[PDB]
Every structure is written in structure tokens, then in C-alpha cells.
Symmetry: C5
Subunit: 311 residues, 5 copies
């Protein structure tokens, strides 16, 4: 079966629509998401036109094999989508209404800069390759773009699912290609990061600062070194949930900066002990008293600077 011939030299418009049934498995490390959706395609094929008065029938149903169907592919999928043709309906003028239900694993890059207070625009790119006989162009039927009310993505809030109505028409290997951009806007639910990572991380940090109200070097060494080890555990935990980025993430910056606080607390604990052993506890007392204010003040100002730079 060949493509429909043009009336004049016009390209063949394939109107498209995606209706999300299910959203699942947003993998941060992989930068992938799985989707289960309806893909709708519509185009005119005058060769299929019929008289509804004569035929008695208002609509003609077809098997995919029986007619020409545009080969629509997804640009950003891991493997080709698993599709099930739901319906193919032809109206008297030859307008074909194709509907399939598919499942696909989509590769869409994520920006982790503001993690875990980040928002993402996930993409589903539809594409058609033109033939020698005629140029095929994609379009968006907005009446056929949407999502089921029950669509949920664990650990995320779904903001909107829209399509950039204007396709990207470009040449690729001496044939036209017509690409469409379906955008699924999501924002991470940061809630659980507060009681599970952020506040536990701050508690252990504040515990290390109790060494500024202690003259016991042995206890101080234990306080600062022990809490530093728990910070390393949190750093390891955080970096397991994320891919390696050529930029600093928000949490990454805080986590990194906190190492400097532990390092300076050790220097302080060391300086205090050395002075007290050298029979200079008055000087050690001044440094320890200043530290009590300096450490929380510098921590709060540093966080204000970071929050400003990232948001």
C-alpha cells in the first residue's frame, strides 16, 4: 500500500494526540520514565472515500493491514513502543481515525540543580519520515491531548501535559522529518527529604557544636569525628538516589559545605587542646566563645548565599 496522493502538491497532515493512562517509574539515575497512553492519528485518504447514502454505513472499520497507515515513531524511547491497535475508523470523505494504546520507556534529561526542590519538563517526541511520493507533516489535535484524572507519578506532582502545536520540520538523510514535542510538567514532592535527610543532617551538625561548650578533648574528638562519619553516610545515601552531574546540585552544595564546617570544628577542637596543654586556657576560652557564635552565624549566612544562588 502506497501513501495517499496529493490533490495539489500539499504535504499530508497527520493530526496526533497522546492521552496518558498511566505514569510510572521516574528513575532519576537513568533519567527515564515509563508511560502507558493512547496515541491517536488522523489523516485523509480519498481512496477510502465512500457514499454514506449508498453504503448505508456512516463509518467503515479496518484492520491495519488493509490500509496505508503513517509510520509514527518516538524519538526519545529506549526500545520501540509496545502498541495495540484499538480502532481504525474511516468516514465517508476518507478521513481515517486511528487509535492505539501503547507503553514506552522514555529517555528525558533531568535538571538536578535545585534538587530536591526541582521541577521538570519531561518530553515525548513524536516523529514521521516523509516518503519519495509525498511529504508527511505532523499536527496536534488538542481535543485528543490529555491525561486520566487518576494519573499519578510516585514522588512527584503532575502540573500539566501539553503539546507544542508547531512541529520541527527538518531534513535527515535526504528526506523530510516532522517532529512534535509533548511536554509533561512535573514538580518533585520534597516533603520526605526534610524529616529523612535535611533535619537528621542538621541535628548531627548541631551535636558536633556542643564541643564548643566542652573542654574535654577526648569527648570533643568523639563528638566531631562521630557526627562527621554520619554526615559521610548521608552524603553516600544522597548520591545513590542521583546520577553524576557536571554541576553542583542544591543538596550537594549544602552537603559539601558542611564538610568545611566539620573540618574547621576539628581545627578549633585541636587549637583549644594545644593551648590548654601549653597553659594558655584563657586564649583557648576566647576562641571557644567566639566559635559558639561564629559557627551558627556563618552556617546561616552561607545557607542564605546558597539559597540565593540556587533559587
Amino acid at each position: 500500500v502506497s501513501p495517499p496522493p496529493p490533490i495539489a502538491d500539499e504535504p499530508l497532515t497527520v493530526n496526533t494526540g497522546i492521552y496518558l493512562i498511566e505514569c510510572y517509574s521516574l528513575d532519576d539515575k537513568a533519567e527515564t520514565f515509563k508511560v502507558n497512553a493512547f496515541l491517536s492519528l488522523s489523516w485523509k485518504d480519498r481512496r477510502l472515500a465512500f457514499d454514506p447514502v449508498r453504503s448505508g454505513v456512516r463509518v467503515k472499520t479496518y484492520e491495519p493491514e488493509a490500509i496505508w497507515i503513517p509510520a509514527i515513531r518516538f524519538v526519545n524511547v529506549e526500545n520501540a513502543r509496545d502498541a495495540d491497535v484499538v480502532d481504525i475508523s474511516v468516514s465517508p470523505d476518507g478521513t481515517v481515525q486511528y487509535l492505539e494504546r501503547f507503553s514506552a520507556r522514555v529517555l528525558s534529561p533531568l535538571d538536578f540543580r535545585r534538587y530536591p526542590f526541582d521541577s521538570q519538563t519531561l518530553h515525548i517526541y513524536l516523529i514521521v519520515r516523509s516518503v519519495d511520493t509525498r511529504n508527511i507533516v505532523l499536527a496536534v489535535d488538542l481535543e485528543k491531548v490529555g491525561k486520566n484524572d487518576d494519573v499519578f507519578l510516585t514522588g512527584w506532582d503532575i502540573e500539566s501535559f501539553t503539546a507544542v502545536v508547531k512541529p520541527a520540520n527538518f531534513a535527515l538523510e535526504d528526506r523530510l522529518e516532522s517532529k512534535l514535542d509533548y511536554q509533561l510538567r512535573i514538580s518533585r514532592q520534597y516533603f520526605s527529604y526534610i524529616p529523612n535527610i535535611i533535619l537528621p543532617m542538621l541535628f548531627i551538625l548541631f551535636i558536633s557544636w556542643t564541643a564548643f561548650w566542652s573542654t574535654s578533648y577526648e569527648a570533643n574528638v568523639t563528638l566531631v569525628v562521630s557526627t562527621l562519619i554520619a554526615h559521610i553516610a548521608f552524603n553516600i545515601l544522597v548520591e545513590t538516589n542521583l546520577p553524576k552531574t557536571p554541576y553542583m546540585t542544591y543538596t550537594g552544595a549544602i552537603i559539601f559545605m558542611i564538610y568545611l564546617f566539620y573540618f574547621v570544628a576539628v581545627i578549633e577542637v585541636t587549637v583549644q587542646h594545644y593551648l590548654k596543654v601549653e597553659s594558655q586556657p584563657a586564649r583557648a576560652a576566647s576562641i571557644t566563645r567566639a566559635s559558639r557564635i561564629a559557627f551558627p552565624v556563618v552556617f546561616l549566612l552561607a545557607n542564605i548565599i546558597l539559597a540565593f544562588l540556587f533559587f
Copy 2:
């Protein structure tokens, strides 16, 4: 093959039934479960009606290809179900009895608010889309809804498997969809959480309180910081078995609250040492004696408040 034509303008009723053979892999992080079951479908097709006397047969067996079969899909499935047609039997009046055995990975959301003492209602949503020629509506044959007595779900107790007999009829892309809700009620076997997480977590916490019967700052720092690190290990362990939720879970709240107890125990240990170094051990003795009562009492009252709020 076209759908059965209506006698009058009535929709076609497809009676359904699901009989669970196997239940497995309830994944909490994924919020999925795997099922292996019988799907039964029944509808009247008068074009298939026959005279038992002339034919000799009192039931006719068919191959799926030979006749029209309604395209039934599951809404909440990762990938389309793996089905195997077991039987298709037609009675003289044209009533078709279709049976298939399927396996599917079902996506059903879980409420972790009362974890690990939670109960869930897992869903299997059956759907059918109408055709241009006629509207298809779903029904429940209760005689064909059930589960094998041996059906077990590791870590869970199976309470019931029932169906909401009235479908949720709605329009989707200008065609009627008829959706049925099959509900599998389960309750989590919380038993193992008691010897493996809850009691070890309480033991380490109570160990931190032995610092209220010690004047040794160095030993106290060791007691409270060491047990805090073991609590972080339990928090990490717990959060690996669960997805990130935009709400507090029962265990999550207890785990979080216990951090405040460790924090205040460190403040106490610090205050006691500072006072004793300042030659004020009488005042330190009063704070330590009060702590011995205050810590267990406040812990027990806080847990009563939490248990009340969650149950």
C-alpha cells in the same frame, strides 16, 4: 468481524469475572503487585444462535479469530496483560462464554500513613471502549468472581476480592468507556517489624538514657552519639523499604521524633558537664534526676499522642 447488532438501541452488556489463581510481588516502592488469574467474558451474539436438534451439538466451541470478541483492557497495568484463551463456548441462544488465563503487573497506589500496621485496597480496573456501530457496557457475574483458597501474598493477609457491580461509564475521545473496579483487600502482617525494627530501635534509645545515671561526660557522649548512629542506620533501613510520600507515615513520625530525644539527651549531657566543670554539680544533679523521669514520661505521652493521631 463486526459487533453484534442491537434488537433495539440498547448497549451490549459484557458480563465479566476475575478468579485469582496467584498473587505475588507486592512492591511497596513501585506500588505494584503481580497477578495470575482467569478472566471470564460473556455476551449475546444472536448471529451465532443455533438449533441444537439440527446441529447435534448443544454447545459450539470457537477459535478467537472465528468470532467477534469485545476488546477488554486493564486500565492500571504497567504493560498489557499476557493472555491465553482457554475456551470460547456458544450456547443455542447465541450466548458466548469466553475464558482466558492472564498474568499482569498491576499499578495500584498504597496508603503508607499507618505503616507497617496498614491495610490496602488493591484495584484491578477492567475497561471496554465502544465502537461506532454500538456501545459496550461492562457487568459483573458474581458467580465468576473469586480466588483460589491457596492464594497467598507474602507479607500480607488477603481479606476479600470483590467487584463494584455498577461500572463507571464516561466519555473518552467521544466514545463511551465502561470501567469496572475489582477490589482486593489486604492487610500487612506487621509481626516481623516488632523484633527486627521496633524493639531494636527502642533498646538503643533506652541505652542512651543510661547516660542519666552517669557523671562520665566521655562515656555519655559515647552512649548518646553511638546509639544515635544506630538510629540513623534504622531510619535508612526503613526508608529503603518504602517510597517517598508527601505525608508522614506512622513509623516515620516515631523515627523522626526519636531524633529530638537524642538531640535533647546531648543538650542534657552537655549541660551536666558544663555545670560540673563550673563547680555546680548540685544543679547538674537536679537536671539529671529530672531527666531520668522526664525522658521516659515525655516519650510515652508523645507516643500516645502519635498513636491517637494515626489510629
Copy 3:
């Protein structure tokens, strides 16, 4: 193609056999095992009778599509088995000898009560559903039940592979169903648990008891708290190799009980320090001396009681 017709009203006997080629992946958490085996089926189909003089062949070979083959399924599989038809041989009377090689992931519940000194009876349930025309019943050809001498299951000893010769015939959705029970008896190789979990766990426990020969509170706190943390690591390790059970496992009980020993050792260490600080070391000396005997004696008696209760 219809099933073979009866000579009289007798059901159709399908003789079965399973010959294990490979056993692998016994997953404790999943309660599954993977099997690669021969499935042999035999039944009479008089419609397939032939004269070897005419046909010029004593046995006829067929493609599965060419003839009626009973639809044999496995009850307890995750997904439908991967099968490859090896041979189909028809002798002149119409006796069909079907042979397939399959691989399947079998769901079979495990009893961890005596873990890791436990034994299991793994099951492979064969089933057939009757048709309108005639009742199909399963049987066991014992000459065709067995296992390759080289069949090994990593971490287990294979005791026997037998079949319960009498099928379970029962009605399911108004049709007879014929079930067969193939039983693979295995027993766990508990060896590696001794040098990797049990003995390391006892060594750290005995190390904590050296605190009963020390008057150094700071050293004692370190001894008991440090070894308790290593016990938590072993508990976490053990529970990762097992599913969450609504009962106590043997190892689980020992692991749990050992927490009580660590808890009481902390109480002792605390009591000893409090007394020595209160200038009562004579009383502390009595408690410490008693502990030296009490702790190992109570540990040994408690283990005798547990071993008795579990075996």
C-alpha cells in the same frame, strides 16, 4: 480441532511426566525457583490411526498445529512457561507421544521456621481444564518422572523429585479441572551460615562479656555499645536474605534474644559504675562476679530452650 471422541462415556486420560534438566535461582524473599525440564504428555486419538503399509512409516511425526493437543498449564507459575516442542509421535492405534522442553519460574511457599537448618517441599502443579465435548483427566507415567544426576540447586541439597499419582479433580467455573502435584524435596546447606553469621555473632557477644572483668566504665560502654552495633549489622544482613514472616525463624529468635543480653549487659555496666561512684565497689564486685557466670549460663540454657522449641 475438537478433542478425541470417547468409545463409551470414559474421560480422556492424559499421562504426564516431568524430567528435570536444570534447577536454579531458589529466591527465598520471592519464594520462587527456576526450573528447566522435559514435559511429556500421552493420550489416544483414534482419528490419527494409520496403516503403516499405506503410510510407508511405523510412527508418524506431527507439528503441534496439525493436531489436537491437550492444553496443559501450570498452576503455580509467575508467567506462562517457555516451551519448545521436541517431538510429537503418533503410533498406528492413535497413541500420541508429545515431548516438550520448558523453562518456568515456579511460585512455591517456603517455611523459614527452622532457617537456616530448614527443609522444603517445592511444588509444580500441572493442570487441565475439561471441555463441553469431554472430560480430560491427568495421570502420572512414573517411567517418565525423574531428574538428571547433575541437577544441582546452589545452596541446597536435592532429596527427591516425585509425583502424587492421584490427581485433584474439582469443578471450577462449571467445568472439571484435573490437577497433579509434582514434589521436589530439598534441604538447605546450612554450612556457610556457621563461619559467616553464627560464629562472628557469638564472638562479638563474648567480647562484650569481657566488660565483666573490667572496672573501666568508659571501656565497658565502648565494649558493649560497639559489639551491639555489629549485632545490628548482622541482624540487618540476615533479614535481607529473608522475607518478612508472620512467625519467628530460628536465627531470628537467637538474633532477637541476643539484644536482651546486650541490654542487660548495659544495665550491669551502668549499675557497676553507679555503685563504684557511690563508694559501694564491694556490692558492684558481687554483681560483676555473678554476671561472669550468669550471662554464659543463661545464654546456654536459653539456646537449649530455643533449640528444643524449634527442633
Copy 4:
């Protein structure tokens, strides 16, 4: 299509060959390896004989469906191999030269006794099942056994890939079976185990022996208990890379033995403290001085005994 008929009562010889293209994924825990290779089969079928000067062609190419091909299977595969028929060439005398490219996951047992200084013999067992018309026997065409020079197996050295030319002919379910043993000899690259596990493990052990040059019980307890915990971490790490064995492996024995050294170091540290508290430091000094030598000596002697027993 039936098998080739015999000239006399001789069995049909199927000459075989395996040429490895890729080797990957040697999974120690699973005791599996993945292979991508050429499988070559050759046999005479006189029914396919032709006159080259009358047919014009010197060699005839066929589609698998067109001719009888022996059903060759692999004994030790997880799931049936993924095969792609590359070529089928028939020479004038009726000699068929079949070539396929396959990929398979091979289940082959491993001997961890000398790990990580172990060598293995991986197996790929080829098998054919005879038919009623004639017995099929396997043979090895050595000219068609080999491996690509670039074949690498990460973490292993590939020594040789040979075939035991004599097949194992045996009856199985009243038909002859002809098995062939293809052997892939490999030896593990132990190198990385030295800087990552062995030397770090020895460093921490030698660190624990610095307690033999210290009279500080509190410091000694810290030295020995801390390093013991790091040894537990290495033991856990090692046992994650290996399956559970009903025998001791080399690393396992060393790892186990080192626990006894930590245990005795604790006894020593305890004995030294008890004596010094009892005002017997002269006796404690003798035990500590003896320990300084006895420990490394016994350690190094015990290692010689182990190396001897294992190699």
C-alpha cells in the same frame, strides 16, 4: 519432513562446532555466564544430492523450512538460546553445512575453594535426541571449534576453548540422547583483590597489634574493637560477591581465622588490664611482650598451613 534415511543401519552423524564471538557476565553468585557464538552443524542428506554440471550451481543455499535440520539443544542453559540462521549450504553429495549465530545464558557450576586464586572449567553441553526412524549422534569438527582473539571475560583470563570429541550417548525416556562437552578454561584475575581486600584487611589487623605496645586499656579496647568492626565490613563485602558454599573457600578461611586473632587480642587486652588493676603489672608486661611475637608468628604460621591445605 522426515530425517535422512540410512544406507545401512548406521546412526546419523551431526558434526558440530562452536566459535565464541563474545563472552560476558560471569556471575559468581548465579554460577552463570553469557555467551554469543557461532554454532555450526553438518550432516549428509542424500535426498538433497544433485548433479552440479546439470544444476549449474556448485553449492545450493536453503531456507531452514525447506529441509530437515537436526534439533540441537543446549543442556545447561537458563532459557532456550536466541538463534539466527546465518547460512545453509548443500554440496552435490548431499552434505549440509548449517551455520547459526546464537546468544545464551549458560548455567555452569563454579569451584570457589581457592577464591580469589581460582581457575574454572566452564561447560556448554550440546545435545541431540534421536527419532523413531533413526539414531542421531554428535561429533566435533575441530576446524570449526574456536574463539575470536578479542574475546574477553572481565575479571578473568581465558585459557582455552576445546571440545571432548567423544560424545556421551545414553537412553533418556526410551530414545537415544547424544551429548557433547565444550570446555572453556578460565582463571581469575586475582590482582585487584590484593589492594582492595587482602592488604586493607591485613593493615587493620596489624593496627590492632599496636595494643601490644600500649598500657592504655581504653585505647586498646578502641584499637581492637574498631578494627574488628572493619573486619566484619570486609567479611560482609566478600560474602556479597560469592554464593553460599557447603565448603570453606580460601579467603573465607583467612577471614574466619582472623576473628580468632581479634578474640585472643581482646582476651590479652582484658588480662593485661585485670593484672595492672590487681597491682601485678610485671606479669602483665610478660604477657604483652610475648604477645608482640606470638601473634605475628602464629599468624604467619597459620597462613602457611592454610596456603598448604588449599594449594
Copy 5:
């Protein structure tokens, strides 16, 4: 269908091209990467030649089944590629233009010597096998070799994707093979290794050197042993992201060398205590003062030597 016959005895040239659409999953441990691309093939088949004037058409479209297509395979793939034929266009002279979109998991070795500052040359080896009728040779159409500008490989920078235009011609299984080398040059984004592994690792190391400004053996033991344990955690973390190599990696060498620094710091801490207990603190003071300079100087020089040897 047979291959195209030669005009004279010339081989059949199959011009090839690969256009990368997506690059993903560079697995370091597996030494694999997943690719989604266009594979273009072109060859002359005079049997397909047509007169454009009498045919009406300037080009002819074909279904793969209708014509002879060269069987092109990939050498270094795990499983055979998943392909979807996009277009087959025949020009009047019989020149066939074949286009398929494929996805494959390519096995390509990585050199981790300079890790994580390493660069790789990933390979895709295209191959075709000759037939008895004629020799098939591969060529590169450079106009059809490329990559989409949006092609990203998480954690890597893509430098170039080129082809070695001259094929490798060798005999394998008594037929000539024509192999092409497609090279994807990448360089690892080392950025995240600095804040997550390298700097944390240096901070803990420098913390252990504060023991050179302390006379407290108990505190020193804590400082050096605690930080050593955190170094073991980083070593374990690093080795989980990498396969076992028969060579030292850059990070591996640094990580290994740092163990020697911890070992010598323990010797120093021990020597200092022994001397001070023996009433020789003046000598201990000299060793501690020298260590303060020696340790950072030797660390910096050792790193200069290592950086030189590796880069």
C-alpha cells in the same frame, strides 16, 4: 532470493552508515552501552532496474520480503539488535536504499587506568559474511554517518562519532567476513568525583594529621582509627562503581597509598605514646614535630609521582 549476480567477478559493495538518535546506559562494571540509531545500507541489484518512463515511477518502494537484502550483523552486541525497517527505495539503475532504526546493547571494553579522568573509544563493529555465489564487502557512506545534536550520554562528553572507512577482510567458518569499525569517542565528566569522593577523602585524611598536634593517645587512636574506617567506606564506595581490573586505576592508587599514610600515622601515634610512658617525651616531641611536616610533604610528593606515572 539469491544475491545480485556480478557484471564481471567484482565483489558486492554494501555502503553503510550509522546515525545515532540516542546514547544511554554506559555501564562501567558491564563495559556496555545502549544505542538507538539509524542503520542505512545501499547496494546495486540490476535485477531490480526499471525504465522510469514506462513504469511512470522515478523510484520503487519494497517490503523486505520482496527482495534480497544483505544480512548485516553487529559483532560486539549482547543480543541481536531490535530493528524496524523504515524504508527500502529502488532507483531506476537498481540501486537499493535501505533504512532501518535499531536499538542494541553494545559490549565495548573500557580502560579505567586514568579513572575518573578517563576517555574511551566505544566501538560498533558492523559485519557481513560472503556467500558461495559472491563476496560481499562493506563500505562507509560518510554522508550517512553522524549523530543527532541532542545525543547525550549521562556522565560523559561525546567527542566524535566516525568510521574507519577501510573494512577488515578475513576468513571465518570457511567464508570471507567484511568488518567495519564505527568509533564513538567519549570522555568522562570527572566533576562530581571532586565534591563527592576526592575532597571528602582528603578532609578525613587531614583530620587524622591533627593527631600530630595532640599528646592524648586515646584521642589520637580515635582520630586515626575513625578516619581510616571512613576511608574504607570510600574505598568500598569507589570499587562498587567499577569492575575488577588486572591493573591499578588512578583513584585506586591514591586510595591504596592513603592506607599506608594511615598505617604510618598509627605507628607514629604508638611510638609517641610508648616514649611518653617511658619518660622520653622530648624524643617523642621530635618525632611528632617532624611528622607535622613529613606527612603533608611525602603526601604531596607521592601524588606528584602518581599523577606523573598515570598522565
